[PDB]
Nucleic acid binder design. Structure first.
Lengths: 94, 90
DNA sequence: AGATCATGTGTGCC
DNA sequence: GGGCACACATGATCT
């Protein structure tokens, strides 16, 4: 556990910490609600903190999960409406 | 710089660290690709998910979902136009 | 070795 | 006479 060796942890662990920061920033940058903002932290006029990015990430996913429910509902409504038109048209002469 | 206010600074930092871990765990819990796994870290609540894994997956899963909406949009357009084209018959 | 996560610190902004 | 985020540098553990 010499002087060479503690410099080798503080190389490894610094990387762990900017590795986390960059993943947090990448996540911020695909969320259109917060993508443009500057950050409280070193990635490598309001500053976004790690908590807020992580909170918004969860909300932004609920939003996309919601939208998928709405899309699978929209689809069913439209397929349903196509069905009723095809029936009405098939059975009018009858 | 003193025993009682040392003590307090840590009390604080522990809470900050558990807030970040709980937020990461929530982000995990909403991503069905990873939601039911174990965690490498303490939440304030056989191999364990790590922080960066949850972060990478959250980005993977948001791209997936954004990409699917484009497919959903197309499915909707194809249907709306199939309706257009039945109704112009009357 | 190398990654990871937990613990104390010191710093700087509100 | 305060809390906060964040960075840093260690210690402990696991592959």
């Amino acid at each position: 556990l010499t002087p060479f060796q503690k410099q080798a942890h503080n190389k490894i662990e610094k990387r762990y910490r900017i590795n986390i920061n960059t993943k947090i920033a990448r996540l911020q940058q695909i969320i259109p609600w917060v993508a443009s903002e500057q950050t409280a932290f070193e990635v490598g006029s309001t500053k976004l903190n790690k908590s807020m990015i992580l909170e918004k990430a969860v909300d932004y996913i609920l939003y996309l999960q919601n939208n998928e429910r709405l899309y699978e509902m929209e689809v069913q409504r439209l397929k349903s409406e196509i069905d009723t038109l095809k029936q009405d048209q098939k059975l009018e002469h009858h």
